[PDB]
Design a protein around this ligand. Structure first.
Ligand SMILES: Cc1cccc(C)c1OCC(=O)N[C@@H](Cc1ccccc1)[C@@H](O)C(=O)N1CSC(C)(C)[C@H]1C(=O)N[C@H]1c2ccccc2C[C@H]1O
Lengths: 99, 99
């Protein structure tokens, strides 16, 4: 698809068998999702945004679908304001910026 | 141009007669630049994301150049950790996400 930016680039994702809304976010290095249950062990990570820093849980090799495109990679879980698909998975689905 | 997402999509912008590096950020509704002078009236605004909110000055009808493309729009000025080109100006240069 080609997604214009007149509104927020919100898309449907599937993670843990559940449909959710997430923002395709080229300003995010990594993908961050609101509190939910994911399998496996997690590792600590601190991430910095416009308002400062938050602690998140880092899960690796997580299966996730983004607009029907299958990806498997790192998903951070924590108090993000909106679910964000960041560059780590945008690259997996072959997403680019174009003008 | 086509910009891949293996690294942060940073570009050079011209604003208020100054050159600055900024992040092409599809997660940002608006454009925010570190402290600098801009012409005209402004009003205060709070903007929020990861880590919470910061206070900025909102300047309207500001001309910026991004990769040879002139655009006009609202520019916020304040203590942002990274200079950010948001959707309000990305649309104007005809920037889209594609996969
Ligand atoms: C650096 C890093 C490492 C690992 C993992 C991650 C996720 C990561 O990125 C962190 C991050 O937050 N990145 C920022 C970009 C940024 C990087 C570094 C410092 C500050 C901002 C990006 O993802 C974003 O714009 N965001 C995210 S929350 C949001 C509401 C969707 C939106 C935002 O603030 N949006 C707000 C915004 C921003 C600028 C102007 C106006 C407005 C209004 C809101 O739309």
């Amino acid at each position: 698809p080609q997604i214009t930016l007149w509104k927020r680039p919100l898309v449907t994702i599937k993670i843990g068998g559940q449909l959710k809304e997430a923002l395709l976010d080229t300003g995010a290095d990594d993908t961050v999702i609101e509190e939910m249950s994911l399998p496996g062990r997690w590792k600590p990570k601190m991430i910095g945004g416009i308002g400062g820093f938050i602690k998140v849980r880092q899960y690796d090799q997580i299966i996730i679908e983004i607009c029907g495109h299958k990806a498997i990679g790192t998903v951070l879980v924590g108090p993000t304001p909106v679910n964000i698909i960041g560059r780590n998975l945008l690259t997996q689905i072959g997403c680019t910026l174009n003008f």
